[PDB]
Amino acid sequence: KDYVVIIGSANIDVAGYSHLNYADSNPGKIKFTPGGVGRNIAQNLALLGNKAWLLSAVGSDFYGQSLLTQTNQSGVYVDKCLIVPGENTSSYLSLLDNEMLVAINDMNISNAITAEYLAQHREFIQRAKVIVADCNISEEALAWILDNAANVPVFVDPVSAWKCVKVRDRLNQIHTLKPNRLEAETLSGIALSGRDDVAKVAAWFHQHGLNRLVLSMGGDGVYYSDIRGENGWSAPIKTNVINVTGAGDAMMAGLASCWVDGMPFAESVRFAQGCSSMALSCEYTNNPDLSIANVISLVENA
Amino acid sequence: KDYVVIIGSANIDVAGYSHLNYADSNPGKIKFTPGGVGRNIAQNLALLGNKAWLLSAVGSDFYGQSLLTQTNQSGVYVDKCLIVPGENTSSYLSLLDNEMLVAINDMNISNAITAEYLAQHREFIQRAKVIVADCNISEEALAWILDNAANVPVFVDPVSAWKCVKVRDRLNQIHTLKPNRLEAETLSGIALSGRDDVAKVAAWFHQHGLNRLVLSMGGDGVYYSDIRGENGWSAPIKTNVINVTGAGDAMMAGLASCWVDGMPFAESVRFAQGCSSMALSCETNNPDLSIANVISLVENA
Ligand SMILES: Nc1ccn([C@@H]2O[C@H](CO)[C@@H](O)[C@H]2O)c(=O)n1
Ligand SMILES: Nc1ccn([C@@H]2O[C@H](CO)[C@@H](O)[C@H]2O)c(=O)n1
Numbered sequence: 001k002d003y004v005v006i007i008g009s010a011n012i013d014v015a016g017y018s019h020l021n022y023a024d025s026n027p028g029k030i031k032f033t034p035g036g037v038g039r040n041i042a043q044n045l046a047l048l049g050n051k052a053w054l055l056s057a058v059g060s061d062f063y064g065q066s067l068l069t070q071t072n073q074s075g076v077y078v079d080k081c082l083i084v085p086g087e088n089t090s091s092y093l094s095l096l097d098n099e100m101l102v103a104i105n106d107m108n109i110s111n112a113i114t115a116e117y118l119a120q121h122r123e124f125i126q127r128a129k130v131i132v133a134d135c136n137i138s139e140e141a142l143a144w145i146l147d148n149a150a151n152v153p154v155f156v157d158p159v160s161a162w163k164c165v166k167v168r169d170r171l172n173q174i175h176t177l178k179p180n181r182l183e184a185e186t187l188s189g190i191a192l193s194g195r196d197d198v199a200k201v202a203a204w205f206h207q208h209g210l211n212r213l214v215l216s217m218g219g220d221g222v223y224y225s226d227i228r229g230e231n232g233w234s235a236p237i238k239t240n241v242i243n244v245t246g247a248g249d250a251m252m253a254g255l256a257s258c259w260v261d262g263m264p265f266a267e268s269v270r271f272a273q274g275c276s277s278m279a280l281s282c283e284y285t286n287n288p289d290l291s292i293a294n295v296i297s298l299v300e301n302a
Numbered sequence: 303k304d305y306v307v308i309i310g311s312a313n314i315d316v317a318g319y320s321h322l323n324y325a326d327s328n329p330g331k332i333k334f335t336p337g338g339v340g341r342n343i344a345q346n347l348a349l350l351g352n353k354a355w356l357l358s359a360v361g362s363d364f365y366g367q368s369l370l371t372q373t374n375q376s377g378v379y380v381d382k383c384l385i386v387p388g389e390n391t392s393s394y395l396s397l398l399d400n401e402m403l404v405a406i407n408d409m410n411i412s413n414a415i416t417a418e419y420l421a422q423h424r425e426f427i428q429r430a431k432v433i434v435a436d437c438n439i440s441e442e443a444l445a446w447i448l449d450n451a452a453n454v455p456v457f458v459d460p461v462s463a464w465k466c467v468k469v470r471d472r473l474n475q476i477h478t479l480k481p482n483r484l485e486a487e488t489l490s491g492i493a494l495s496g497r498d499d500v501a502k503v504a505a506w507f508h509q510h511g512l513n514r515l516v517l518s519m520g521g522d523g524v525y526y527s528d529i530r531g532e533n534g535w536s537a538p539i540k541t542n543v544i545n546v547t548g549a550g551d552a553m554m555a556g557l558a559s560c561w562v563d564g565m566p567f568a569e570s571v572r573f574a575q576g577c578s579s580m581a582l583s584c585e586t587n588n589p590d591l592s593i594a595n596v597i598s599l600v601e602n603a
Contacts, residue, residue, distance in 0.1 A: 012334075012365075014316050014332075014393075014395065016395040016406040016408070017406075018406060020404075022403060022404050023402070023403075023404070024404075024405070025394070025405045025406070025407050026404070026405065026406055026407075027406070027407055027408075027409075028395075028406040028407070028408060029408050030316075030390075030392075030393040030395050030406060030408035031390060032314075032363060032365045032390065032391070032393070061334060061368075062368035062369075062371050062372045063314075063334050063365055063368050065368060066364035066365050066367060066368040067364075069364050070364045088332075088333065088334065089334070090332075091316075091318075091332040091334070093316065093318040093330075093332050093395075093397075095395075095397060095404070095406075100325070101324065101325075102324050102325070102328065102397070103326070103327055103328060104318040104319070104320055104328050104329075104330040104331075104332060104397075105327055105328070105329055105330070105332075106318070106329075106330060106331050106332035107329075160327070
């Protein structure tokens with residue numbers, strides 16, 4: 001009867017690529033995928049075996065409902081997602097070829113994921129084993145979550161260099177933060193020129209109250225640091241990359257899930273890297289063969 | 303108990319525009335609309351009051367189903383549209399700004415609208431009052447429709463200069479064709495430099511067996527020609543244009559509907575221009591397209 005609550009954005013990623021001249025309806029291939037940091041994390045959690053509830057917002061349009069339906073039939077409990085009237089479901093348009101040419105994001109219904117909304121589900125939220133939130137939601141909403149978590153661990157996905165900032169004044173209310181290099185630099189105000197700077201950055205995070213830091217450094221790997229003193233590097237699982245999208249989402253799901261499973265920090269980080277690799281090796285934004293079994297198999301195969 | 307059958311493509315048009323440049327997550331606005339020539343025509347027919355059945359193809363994906371649902375309580379009977387497994391629903395991606403920049407069409411699922419499929423609905427098709435087909439479907443499928451229409455008038459939308467050509471060898475099996483300038487030039491092999499050339503083009507169409515020609519000339523207007531001798535011009539309803547998509551779709555719906563209503567050719571053409579205008583004045587289908595509101599637009603001349 002243990003459930004996980006994910007609070008974030010649910011999107012539709014539309015990817016189009018040609019077989020290219022401008023001012024012409026050029027024949028190509030278009031894919032509709034389910035996306036959104038929060039939604040993706042919820043789905044990866046469900047594929048990891050946890051009972052996951054999504055608290056998101058989608059429009060009164062029909063395509064929103066089919067986003068919810070697809071997600072529900074991925075295993076996610078979507079029956080508390082807010083269907084918002086009059087406004088259209090958010091989306092991530094993306095023009096590729098072979099290398100993305102351009103991308104557009106329409107994500108303002110995220111501001112409908114309000115404090116009043118979450119307050120309507122206060123007790124349900126406060127009786128989860130862990131709450132996962134992304135920084136796509138408004139500063140007020142994130143503030144409400146962190147203010148009303150009732151000692152339920154909040155895992156936060158910073159999303160981008162632009163949207164991580166709302167987290168800076170609230171690191172003492174966050175159980176685990178997973179920033180990349182740029183996001184960590186943006187938050188700390190300290191340059192991460194190289195691997196010699198992670199200690200100083202992490203020390204900045206810990207002095208500002210962050211319980212746990214999971215710092216993805218790209219090729220450098222993952223540097224993890226606990227305010228109680230434990231820290232270390234984990235070198236990347238070397239992989240066959242085909243997509244890069246859904247990497248961090250899978251890693252976040254891995255961290256939250258492993259936490260719920262009672263796993264220690266370091267091994268949870270390694271496992272999360274396993275998840276991220278599995279995501280990196282799959283045509284879609286989420287890998288439907290993400291499961292405890294084959295990430296574990298990817299990890300013992302070291 | 304009179305129904306109309308529309309056989310064509312059902313798409314999802316996704317339009318995105320920013321507010322600006324490249325290699326970056328650019329904040330903007332994205333719109334999902336229901337589209338596809340056939341589907342649009344069916345919807346306009348339903349808004350005109352006719353009982354319209356759509357014979358189209360959509361993927362096993364969920365967004366296909368939401369296209370179908372949206373279309374259904376737009377008034378269209380979609381319960382015979384083919385849900386095709388394994389393949390994804392066709393779509394029209396379009397990158398704009400303030401002026402259309404680039405566009406992609408993924409429409410290979412149109413090839414699932416097969417002869418076999420339509421043959422599974424032979425009798426239902428053959429007892430409609432009129433069949434509307436677009437040239438997005440395969441040459442074989444259009445050939446099957448025209449070969450098995452059982453004297454039910456087939457109205458054909460040429461769609462584009464690229465796809466109108468499959469109609470060239472079969473103008474004698476078509477009740478009404480609605481080409482634009484470029485499509486007419488492409489079909490006839492005769493240049494339409496100016497308004498003095500419509501006669502020779504139309505004569506070419508009639509000599510190759512076309513019963514009725516409805517030729518949209520843009521600013522020049524609409525030239526209509528009947529193989530039995532009636533022909534004429536109709537000047538445009540002058541309008542407040544905000545988008546242009548769904549114009550020809552609305553006109554085709556107007557022609558088919560007016561035909562079913564027993565209206566004469568010319569008056570049906572004028573009415574159809576009214577419909578196309580109503581479409582031109584609404585951010586692909588106008589939900590206030592109706593006999594009332596078109597007649598009001600036309601009597602207001
Ligand atoms: N500001 C943004 C940008 C992107 N996304 C979603 O993130 C997914 C890939 O991680 C993509 O599926 C995309 O929809 C998001 O939630 N917020
Ligand atoms: N080859 C094509 C190109 C476009 N379309 C559909 O036509 C509508 C505008 O008339 C748009 O909604 C678009 O989806 C089509 O059915 N086939």
